[model samples]
Target: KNIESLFDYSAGQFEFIDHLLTMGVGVHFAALIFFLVVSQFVAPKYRIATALSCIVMVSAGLILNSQAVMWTDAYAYVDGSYQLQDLTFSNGYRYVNWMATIPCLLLQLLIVLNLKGKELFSTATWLILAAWGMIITGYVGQLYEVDDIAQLMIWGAVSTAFFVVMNWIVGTKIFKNRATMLGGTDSTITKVFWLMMFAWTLYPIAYLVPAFMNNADGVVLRQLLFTIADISSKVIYGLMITYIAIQQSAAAGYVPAQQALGRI
Candidate 1:
């Protein structure tokens, strides 16, 4: 039942909506089955891809829905709503930089700072990327604007990266693995790496919030336990590298053990 001629609705939109309904069901069905069956059979070496696949899937979904909304005009108001959220960074256009570009860059940062050169290159690393990639889905958005979901995504990505790195610093004789994996960082480079990771934590606790906070309760809570994230994004990101460096420097006991990787 299409509404009468007061709006810009079209038959094409109806068809598009039908497609979304049908394909959305199919994709969700696949999501459930893939998780249930694939997790059981994949070897440890390949499990990481599964995680990585999840991110790809998620990014796909966000992009798909965004397109659908454009084709169907569902949530047309979400466009203006997107603007109200003020999703900007320094000198920022919310969609161009903050939502789309920055989070995508965060993916590369995770790979470069944490994933690429790490040791014990198991399925887990790929899985971590998958996890983060799924996170990037929210960042990617369905269309050019409207980024309601990135708020949730950005933090999940933050936590996943932190936990994975925590494992590297504290677990196994893994530095040599990272050494090959990362092409051997000098103490200076390593110091910078740690410092950046150290600072990255501030992102969730500070800057990457606000937009999702919907009420007086949320605003109150956010302010009650917060410092304005006025510091430069680079500074916080650098702190993350700094922390990693500090930890690497402190882990001297593990340094000599890096030689074990070649024999493995």
Candidate 2:
């Protein structure tokens, strides 16, 4: 019953949280528009990466909007502070969004790398499976975030195992395949890979916040971390992938992409 329940938040703290959630919604929708409009500028083969990015944006936007609404409804202003009401505030919506978007994100990476044939099939299958494994196990652990410490640690560790598998595949399979990328996009791929890794790492840190700092301040920090991580991992990472797609298209002699890149 301690899932973000019964907190007395100062006016500043409540406003800060509210603004962050709303900002997340705004950013995701804005990114969605950009991805959809730019998809046509890339080659047909690379358009799927932009399409996947659009999916991520739409899912994240909806989830963040729901979260903002939940946050507003879960508390009431009483005695100059926002106090938790009968309604419970939960982070479960984020997990649901991740389940839908994370696989699409990983697939975007794969699409940009232009993996083909059986190799594409196998890698996509494993990466998507690992992503779900990570998110699902972590979701189970977070349900016990403020209640059962042992369960939280147990499931969190299980989730980390999946994360490690993802890292291994990225390091060996994905990064190695960067050599096969066209239009001098290898360096950009490396940077995007690191950015993805960095962003993904923030998730477990945010997940563990309740274990130690289980308070209103901790909740704020956790949300801040999640918001930053989501933007970087989804929006910025998607843009980077789209850039690579454009570059590849240009190298493949796609006139539209070349014109877009100012190489025409």
| Candidate number with greatest TM-score | 2
For residues 12-85, write the lDDT of model 2, one tens digit per residue: 88899999999999999999999888787899888899999999998999999998999999899999889988
Kindly list the per-residue Cα lDDT of model 1 for residues 1-264, writing each as its tens digit.
Answer: 111111332344334443643464346335534543443233332233334334433443444444444433433324222111222111112122223323332342343334443333543455345434533442343221223445345545555565465435422333333453323434444444454345434434433334454433332233222222212223234233323332332343333223322234
Superposing all C-alpha atoms, what RMSD in Å does each candidate have to the true structure? 16.1, 1.4
Query: Which residue segments of model 2 deviate by more than 4 Å?
Result: none
lDDT, model 1, position 233: 28
**Residue 168 in model 2: shift from native, Å?**
0.8
Question: Distance from true position, residue 185, model 1, in Å?
Answer: 6.5
Q: List, in order, the clash count of every candidate structure.
A: 28, 0
